[PDB]
Amino acid sequence: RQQLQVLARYLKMDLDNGERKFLKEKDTVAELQAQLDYLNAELGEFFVN
Amino acid sequence: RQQLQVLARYLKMDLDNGERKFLKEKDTVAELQAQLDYLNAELGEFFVNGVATSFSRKKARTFDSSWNWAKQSLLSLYFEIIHGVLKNVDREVVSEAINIMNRSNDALIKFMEYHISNTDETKGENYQLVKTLGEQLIENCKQVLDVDPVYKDVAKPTGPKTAIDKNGNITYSEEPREKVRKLSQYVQEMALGGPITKESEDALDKDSTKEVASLPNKSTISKTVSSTIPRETIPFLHLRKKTPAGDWKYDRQLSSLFLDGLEKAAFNGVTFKDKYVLITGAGKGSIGAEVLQGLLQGGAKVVVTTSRFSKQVTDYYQSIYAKYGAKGSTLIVVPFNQGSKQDVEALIEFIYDTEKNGGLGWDLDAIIPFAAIPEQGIELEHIDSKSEFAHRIMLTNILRMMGCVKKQKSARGIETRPAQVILPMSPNHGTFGGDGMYSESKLSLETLFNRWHSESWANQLTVCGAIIGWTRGTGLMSANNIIAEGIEKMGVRTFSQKEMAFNLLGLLTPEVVELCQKSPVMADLNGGLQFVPELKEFTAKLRKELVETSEVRKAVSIETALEHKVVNGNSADAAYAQVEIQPRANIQLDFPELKPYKQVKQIAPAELEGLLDLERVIVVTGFAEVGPWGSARTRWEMEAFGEFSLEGCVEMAWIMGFISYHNGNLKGRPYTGWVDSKTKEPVDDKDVKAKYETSILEHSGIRLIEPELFNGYNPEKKEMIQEVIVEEDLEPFEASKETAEQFKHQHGDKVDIFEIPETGEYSVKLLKGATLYIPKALRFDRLVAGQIPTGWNAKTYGISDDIISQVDPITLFVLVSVVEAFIASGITDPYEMYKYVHVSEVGNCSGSGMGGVSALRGMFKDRFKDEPVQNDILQESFINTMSAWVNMLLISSSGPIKTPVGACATSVESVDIGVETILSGKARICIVGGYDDFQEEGSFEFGNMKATSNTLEEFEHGRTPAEMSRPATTTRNGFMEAQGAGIQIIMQADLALKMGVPIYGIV
Amino acid sequence: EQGIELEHIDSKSEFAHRIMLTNILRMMGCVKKQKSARGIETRPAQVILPMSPNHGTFGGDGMYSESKLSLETLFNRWHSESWANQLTVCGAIIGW
Amino acid sequence: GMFKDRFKDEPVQNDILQESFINTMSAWVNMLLISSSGPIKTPVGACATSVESVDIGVETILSGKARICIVGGYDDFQEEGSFEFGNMKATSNTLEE
Amino acid sequence: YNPEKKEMIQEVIVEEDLEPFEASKETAEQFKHQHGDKVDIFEIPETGEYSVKLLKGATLYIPKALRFDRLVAGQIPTGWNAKTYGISDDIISQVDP
Amino acid sequence: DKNESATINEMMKHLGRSEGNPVIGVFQKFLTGHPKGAAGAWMMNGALQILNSGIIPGNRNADNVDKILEQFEYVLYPSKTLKTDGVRAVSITSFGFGQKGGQAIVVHPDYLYGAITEDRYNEYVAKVSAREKSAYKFFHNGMIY
Ligand SMILES: NC(=O)c1ccc[n+]([C@@H]2O[C@H](COP(=O)([O-])OP(=O)(O)OC[C@H]3O[C@@H](n4cnc5c(N)ncnc54)[C@H](OP(=O)(O)O)[C@@H]3O)[C@@H](O)[C@H]2O)c1
């Protein structure tokens, strides 16, 4: 693991770049899902569908 | 890359796992965003944004302290009469009498008796007036001590009056009606109707004291106004009865009940004691606002909603409660969006929930759902998001609100306390046009008259349909005020909000309440408007006849002026034109006013002359401060008046560094005056307010902590450090030999240091097991403080950069306060004291609770982080160092120096020490007062002690920074920390008289 | 909308009211906009409005009665607005 | 406690600030022993605090505000003040001694 | 307190990423709030703890020791204890010495 | 706020303050906040400004007075400024941490002038008038430079 880290650093590879992007999008999903949930609570399923 | 791949495979590390998860979530985002986009395309932005919740239980503001407001109202009336602001001809006297009688209790009567009995009627006519009025108001309050409070409006009825001046400006004014000078005559006028509605003694305005004497007397009505309704005339206000055919027609008997109630209300007032009311749409200028005022005057318990919950709105309702809230009344103000189904349900749950569960524990008697938004210029083809949203507010969510009340009552088995729903119906069913779905909203409410019979909610709700006539001044109708005089020429009636409110309050009288419990009530409050044929065209013609006359007069007057100008030239109008004087700020020191000896001799007893040892009388000769509102002058304007004069604005703009003075050439021309400190553009005094007042008010007083004032302190990001044991050796770093040896001394075997022979620097290698500190940030919940105005700078006062760099900031507040206190004493050179006293006889007894806390930070924290800190930081921390600097920079006394530390009571301890120092003969003049600073560490600790208000809890309660400090209030929850200094100059009175310094007070 | 009294008015009734009122006004509006965009002032579309004698008489029909009664505004709006040349109003009060 | 221990997220009692105040020692005296409702005038006078105390106590008694007065002074030695008195060169340098 | 070994801290910019260390979610979020892009924190799904990974350019503080030259003081006699006089442990724990 | 009301109320009751004559409370900290050691000094400055103006500032944040305070019949809690026809004396009370209670009473300065003769008073009036003019001179020069 330490050898892989040293090589990652030589190569200027951000190993966590993808898990970092993932957690930003997971927050965007929860923000959009809250907006949708709110509109469902205001209009109801029958209306929204 | 190939070696990294081989190791990734040995380790069973999926390197692409994160980019793979990311692309799955990016697809989930686009799917959710498409659903949201679709709902926006279907409902529109106006609607989607419009249905946002506003309601929260914690934002509910409760007003119930009518016991206190009654005494305030009495004292205000008392002083308004004494000062001649209210005369014996003003109706305000009678209206205030009614509101005081409505709050009559034993304490109020003792209060009035003391104030009125101790009034010296010989001091002037106004004193005799207040004494006579007050004696009558006492007699009234004794008679109504055990009587229910009444809604009773005595305001002059106002008609519409449109005026076009010579130059074609249109003035709309509410003008007193000639025939109708009381509500009793208004009711008579309503009863008689007009020719268009024909099918086939009092002391008001002359002796308010006499009118007040009449107020408790229940006037007997021999013959009712209903008996005067002509045969074959429909009153302007009437009730309708549903015919067997299913048409609603004028009913003389029901109409007689309503109009007799209005007549009794107008003479005797009506009580709403023990009515619980929800009212929506009661903002300033609304009908609802006037309905609210009457309900509170009659002792109702009211929930009022607002879609614009703010400090300005809560202060509006507070002022309404304090003026009109009768004994037993309560006003609850809640944020609310009637366009939100969630708000509707939450509001009603709140009202009905037990106090234990955080509700009001109420059961509604009346619902007045007047929330509306204007739809203007929206014809059929424009009906879109806004109109759908408006229709949700004005129809759908009214049905849902009624439904919610029905469900709450039925869940609790309440079958014998129905809520009267006063429905705001309209004669406008698509007659005007351009109002979106307004007409559809209003006409749809008419189904409730039939649904009351056909469904299962009649025992929980009653239906009272008010067909509301042309009411001037409201959010919906203000755009139509200019033509109302013309409409009335047809023998038809338009209404003030006061009159309409009075009409609607007539529906809540016990007789109409009982009528709606038998069957739905339809009340026509339309002022005969329905008998005007082709109304829209009639209103468009009155509008054109007015706008055409305005625009023609404007054009003809402009051309007649230009013709005169051409024929007579500039010399004709140069001598006619006239010079305007704009005020300049003339800041005054506000020395006390000295009366002629004869006047001053009358206040003290005659025996006082020669009785006192004036060496033992201590006076204040000067005072100053530096605080969140500037100086003592600016803080007083804000405290006493709530706003700055021109002098206050200019002082604040100068204090805050917005303006600077300039004397010399400025862009060629010679200029003497204020300039903008940044741009160096001239600023006239008259423009300081428009240019800077908003900035002054935003950056003064109690406000969010500004990090730039507190060395970058940010309560949202408080810097701490966490000790961590290094698990693996760190990458070596370079340090000087000196520093490397200090690392080695600390860590011993957990560090290796090695000379780098080339450079003479050292490598430092922290090893496994070594202790490190890693910065971490904490969110702290005290975000607000009383801060000295942003831009305050000791250099503005004259303090040199050498002093500023040496002393703790607290010391600068003191130095400024002291010089300003001396100026307020008229001592501009402190050495003048030494013409009168020995250098041993000028003392400093001022102190601090905590002293130079920025210097403490220096020595406890900055020094520990090896930051640059002046070598004599310790001395600048001491509580007595501020007084030392005062003596060292300004006073040069050899007098007493007694520095108290008394936490929050330091300034009073200071005065006690100063007084005793002067009475002991040790000093003749003493600098007294107190000072303290605001900094991170003390704020944190006052928060850990829970002494200060938690800002996040305040924000949950909808409080803004300006309302977080609310002493003696029900919901007070901790102090608001501030900073600054205050100083007085005290001396022996004998010396103050000999020096000729101003005397502000005797200690 | 069956068995939907006042206290039950919810999603379905709001949606039904959109179908039976709001989107009828929008449909009329759309036809007005199309005709006006093309300068058609002499070929009005007759709107046969399905009106009802049921204005809350039976109960339990959600916002039905509100939808039907609200259509009656069109009789006045035809005179008060600017769409009379594009649309005519024919209110049919439909019996049992 | 409040300037350094709190910054290092060390355990510090929540009411540490009150125990710092120069007048808290007199408050504890009153709270634990005396229970008076008499004058409380806490001087701060650096090295002359105890004489300022006596002057205040004397004047408090001569003014008629008290008949008995607890006078005196107190101070502690700790790292930080020792360091700063050294930076001001007020204290003797032990290595020179 | 040992004047011969006075504890200070020196701010150092991390030149290379540190070995990750474990912290609670709460603490990890306080590190993230402070350092922003100069730290990475990741839930460890098994335990619910967080890895904290300080990156190149992050600010650390490294303890260092200074020899101070005031080594002597007038100290209350070694073994003085307020309990000898009768003062309870509750008072001792509450008040400044 | 409860302890302070109760204390003022008990002082007034013990000294036979007239029933119906509450002291009018001023609560300057609604506007300024609490500056710890400066608190009394700002209040004293206020008190002096009240005495010389007759204007009693109201607590504009007094939305609803705590019902617990109704028992204190000798206190009145205004929400708005009252322009009186004169204030003769003001009480300033302070309560610090560590049982630091304080009270100061300030009396209207015009009660001093009954202690002296007309000639002394007129000499003083002239001196103060001259000093005030010199102070305005000093103040405006200082402010602008
Ligand atoms: N001539 C007339 O004026 C007339 C005639 C016939 C019927 N009416 C009816 O009488 C009622 C009141 O009329 P008005 O002229 O007094 O209306 P208005 O002055 O426009 O007042 C309506 C109030 O509703 C509040 N409001 C706005 N949007 C809201 C929301 N989303 N949720 C909660 N409240 C909201 C606003 O007060 P806040 O800003 O405090 O939120 C607004 O001031 C209406 O239903 C109207 O149709 C009026």
Q: Do chains B and F touch (3 or more CB pairs under 8 A)?
A: yes
The domain over range A1-44 is classified in CATH as 3.30.930.10: no
Partners of chain D (3+ Cβ pairs below 8 A): B, E, F
Q: Are B164 and B210 in contact (CB under 8 A)?
A: no
**CB of D83 within 8 Å of any CB in chain E?**
yes
How many whole angstroms from B713 Cα to the centroid of ligand 1?
Answer: 45
Q: Answer yes or no: do D21 and F97 touch at CB < 8 A.
A: yes
Q: Which protein residues are within 6 Å of ligand 1, measured from CB? A: B 280-281, 283, 285-288, 305-308, 336-339, 370-373, 393-394, 424, 426, 468, 470-471, 474-477
Given a contact cutoff of 8 angstroms between Cβ atoms, the answer to whether B344 and B338 are in contact is yes
Q: Angle at Cα B730 formed by Cα B727 and Cα B733, nearest 5°? A: 160
Q: Rounded to 5 degrees, what are φ and ψ at B860?
A: -90, -25
Could you tell me the two tokens for B154? 């005595």
| Burial (CB count within 10 angstroms: exposed 0-12, middle 13-18, buried 19+), residue F115 | buried
Q: Could you give the CA distance from residue B288 to residue B369 in angstroms, rounded to a whole number?
A: 9
Query: Cα separation of B258 and B256, whole Å?
Result: 5
Residue B30 CA: distances (Å) to CA of A19, B36, B385, C22, E55: 19, 10, 24, 30, 32
Report domain B714-780's class: alpha beta
**And the tokens for B463?**
């239906």
Six-digit token string for F76:
């009145």
User: Is residue B250 a contact partner of residue B234, using CB atoms and an 8 Å limit?
Assistant: yes
Task: Please answer whether residues B842 and B924 qualify as being in contact, where contact means their C-beta atoms are separated by less than 8 angstroms.
Answer: yes
B675, B662 contact by CB (below 8 A): yes
Looking at beta carbons, which pairs linking B114-122 to residues 24 or more positions away fall under 8 Å? B114/F18, B114/F19, B114/F20, B114/F21, B115/B74, B115/B75, B115/B78, B115/F20, B115/F21, B116/B78, B118/F21
F140 is catalytic: no
Structure tokens at B544: 């054109």
Q: How far apart are CA D71 and CA D73, in angstroms?
A: 7
For B945-1003, the DSSP string reads TT-B--HHHHHHTT--GGGS--TTBTT--SB-BB-EEEEEEEEEHHHHHHHT----EE-
Determine the residue of B429, B435, B468 to mutate for testing ligand 1's pocket, defined as the one with the most ligand atoms within 8 A of the Cβ atom.
B468
The answer, for B391 touching chain C at a CB cutoff of 8 Å, is yes
Return phi, psi of residue B735, to 5°.
-150, 155
Rounded Cα–Cα distance for residues B125 and B117 (Å):
16
Q: Nearest Cα to F39, choosing from B883, B929, B877?
A: B929
Residues in chain A with CB shorter than 8 Å from the CB of E40 are 16, 20
Please, are residues B997 and F98 in contact by the beta-carbon 8 Å criterion? no
At B175 the three-state DSSP class reads strand
Q: Strand B330-335 vs strand B61-63: parallel, antiparallel, or unpaired?
A: antiparallel
Strand partners, B60: none
CATH assignment of E2-68, given 3.40.50.2300, 3.40.50.620, 3.30.70.2490, 3.40.50.300? 3.30.70.2490
Give the 3-state secondary structure of B839-898: HHHEEECCEECCCCHHHHHHHHHHCCCCCCCCCCHHHHHCCCHHHHHHHHHHHCCCCCEC
In A, minimum Cα distance to C18 occurs at A47
Q: How far is CA B656 from the centre of its chain?
A: 24
Tell me, what amino acid is at B500? M
Nearest atom in ligand 1 to the alpha carbon of residue B470 is 1
Quick check: B627 and F38 CB within 8 A? yes
Beta strands (DSSP E) in E1-97 are: 6-13, 21-23, 39-43, 50-54, 59-66
Question: How far lies B79's CA from each of B72, B325, B874, in Å?
Answer: 11, 21, 54
Q: In B234-309, which ranges are E strands?
A: 238-242, 248-250, 276-280, 301-306
Burial of B936 (0-12, 13-18, 19+ CB in 10 A): buried
Counting Cβ atoms within 10 Å, is residue F83 exposed (0-12), middle (13-18) or buried (19+)?
middle
For residue B730 the two structure tokens come to: 């760190």
d(CA B292, CA B278): 10
Taking only residues 25 to 64 of chain D, the set having a beta carbon closer than 8 angstroms to any beta carbon of chain B reads 39-46, 52, 55-56, 59-60, 62-63
Q: Among F40, F55, F50, which Cα is nearest to F109's?
A: F50
Q: Give which of D60, B982, D71 is closest to F94, Cα–Cα.
A: B982
Q: Which of E18, E37, E40, E55 to mutate to test the interface with A (most CBs of A within 10 A)?
A: E40
Distance CA B789, CA B530 (A): 60
Token pair 């903002």 is found at: B283
Closest listed residue to residue B174, CA positions, set B642, B495, B650, B401 = B495
Neighbours of B516 (CB within 10 A): 22
Residue C56 and residue B450: Cβ atoms within 8 Å? yes
| φ/ψ of residue B978, rounded to 5 | -135, -175
Cβ within 8 Å of residue B562, ≥6 positions away? none
Please measure the distance between the N-terminal and C-terminal CA atoms of chain C and give it in whole angstroms: 17
**Residue located nearest, by CA, to atom 44 of ligand 1:** B370
Residue B118 to residue B451: CA distance in whole angstroms = 63
With contacts defined as CB-CB under 8 Å, which chain F residues touch B929? 38, 41, 44
**Cβ neighbour number for residue B307 with a 10 Å cutoff:** 19
B380 to C14: CB separation less than 8 angstroms, yes or no? no
Q: What are phi and psi of B290, to 5 degrees?
A: -75, -35
> From ligand 1's centre to the CA of B280, what distance in Å?
8
- CA–CA distances in Å: residue B871 to residues B683, B809, B916, D94, E9: 44, 17, 37, 19, 18
Alpha helices in B150-269 (DSSP H): 183-192, 208-214, 252-268
Is residue B216 within 8 A of residue B94, CB to CB? The reply is no
If one counts every other C-beta atom within 10 angstroms of the C-beta of residue B132, the result is 18
The one-letter amino acid code at B488 reads: E
Q: What is the resolution of this structure in A?
A: 1.9
Sign of CA dihedral B120, B125, B128, B129: negative
Whole-number Å distance between alpha carbons of B830 and B414: 78
Domain boundaries, given as residue ranges, for chain A:
1-44
How wide is the angle at C-alpha B932 spanned by C-alphas B928 and B933, nearest 5°? Answer: 150
Of B382, B432, B440, the CB nearest to C21: B440
B968 and F3 Cβ atoms separated by less than 8 Å: no
Residue among B392, B402, B444 whose CB faces C6 most closely: B402
| Single-letter amino acid code for the residue at B842 | V
Burial of F127 (0-12, 13-18, 19+ CB in 10 A): middle
CA distance C2 to chain B (A): 12
DSSP chain D: -TTTTTTTT----TTHHHHHSTTHHHHHHIIIII---S----B--GGGHHHHHHHHHHHHHHTTS-SS----------HHHHHHHHHTT-S--TTT-
Contact call for E62 and B766, based on CB within 8 A: yes
Tokens coding B358 = 């955080």
CA count, 13 A, side-chain hemisphere, B579: 1
Count A/E contacts: CB-CB distance under 8 Å: 7
How many helices (H) and strands (E) are present in chain C, helices listed first? 4, 2
Enumerate the β-bridge partners of residue B435: B378
Max intra-chain CA distance, chain D: 52
The answer to whether the CB of B650 falls within 8 A of the CB of B659 is yes
Homologous superfamily of B45-577: NAD(P)-binding Rossmann-like Domain (3.40.50.720)
Residues ≥6 apart with Cβ < 8 Å to B737: B755, B760, B761, B762
| Nearest-CB residue to D93 (from E70, E73, E97) | E70
Q: B800, exposed or middle or buried, with CB in 10 Å at 0-12, 13-18, 19+?
A: exposed
Of F110, B450, D87, residue with least CA distance to C52? B450
Dump the DSSP string for B667-732: SSSEEEEEEETTT--B--HHHHHHHHHHHHHHTSSEEE--GGGTTT--GGGEEEEEEEE-SSPPPP
* Residue B561, H or E segment: helix B535-568
Q: Are B280 and B288 in contact (CB under 8 A)?
A: yes
Strand B158-164 with B170-176, pairing: antiparallel
CB atoms within 10 A of CB B653: 28
- Say how many CA atoms lie within 13 Å of B395 toward its Cβ: 31
- The span from the CA of A35 to the CA of B408, in Å, is 29
Measure CA B323 to chain center.
16
* SS3 assignment, position B396: helix
Residue F13 C-beta-side C-alpha neighbours within 13 Å: 11
The DSSP symbol for E96 reads -
Atom of ligand 1 nearest to the CA of B307: 41
> Using CA atoms, how far apart are residues B425 and B421, in angstroms rounded to an integer?
12
Q: How far apart are CA E63 and CA E61, in angstroms?
A: 7
**Which amino acid makes up residue B819?**
V
Rounded to whole angstroms, how far apart are CA atoms E7 and F104? Answer: 48
Token duo for residue B382: 């424009």
Please tell me whether residue C55 adopts helix, strand or coil conformation.
coil
How many whole angstroms separate alpha carbon B594 and alpha carbon B574? 47
CB A42 within 8 A of CB B53: no
Q: Got the DSSP string for B645-658?
A: -HHHHHHHHHHTTS
| Cβ–Cβ under 8 Å, residues B421 and B462 | yes
Is the torsion defined by CA of B124, B129, B130, B131 positive or negative? positive
φ/ψ region of B240 (left if φ > 0, alpha if ψ in -120 to 50, else beta) reads beta
Largest Cα–Cα separation, chain C? 47
Residue B348, phi then psi, degrees to nearest 5:
-65, -40
The torsion angle over the Cα atoms of residues B89, B95, B101 and B103, rounded to 10 degrees, is: -140
Residue in B940, B788, B1002, B893 with CA at minimum distance from that of residue F38: B788
CB contact under 8 A, F97 and D27: yes
Q: ∠ CA(B96), CA(B101), CA(B106), 5° rounding?
A: 130
Q: What is the largest CA-CA distance in chain A?
A: 58
Report D:14-33 residues touching F (Cβ under 8 A).
Answer: 18, 21, 23-24, 26-27, 30-31
Dihedral angle sign, alpha carbons of residues B88, B90, B93, B95:
positive
d(CA F28, CA B965): 10
DSSP state, residue B373: -
Helices B125-143, B106-117: axis angle to 10 degrees equals 160
Per-residue three-class SS string for B88-144: CCCHHHHHHHHHHHCCCCHHHHHHHHHHHHCCCHHHCHHHHHHHHHHHHHHHHHHHC
Q: Which DSSP state fits B495?
A: B
What are the tokens at B514?
Answer: 């009982």
CA distance B789 to B522: 59
Q: Strands B330-335 and B301-306: what pairing?
A: parallel
Question: Measuring CA to CA, which residue among B424, B400, B398, B160 is closest to residue B291?
Answer: B424
Angle among Cα B582, B584, B588 to the nearest 5 degrees reads 145
Contacts of F77 (CB under 8 A, 6+ apart): B65, B68, B968, F25, F27, F59, F62, F65, F69
Among B887, B757, B751, smallest CA distance to B830 is for B887
Closest CA to B177 of B196, B153, B161: B161
Q: Which residues on neighbouring strands pair with residue B25, listed in sequence order?
A: none
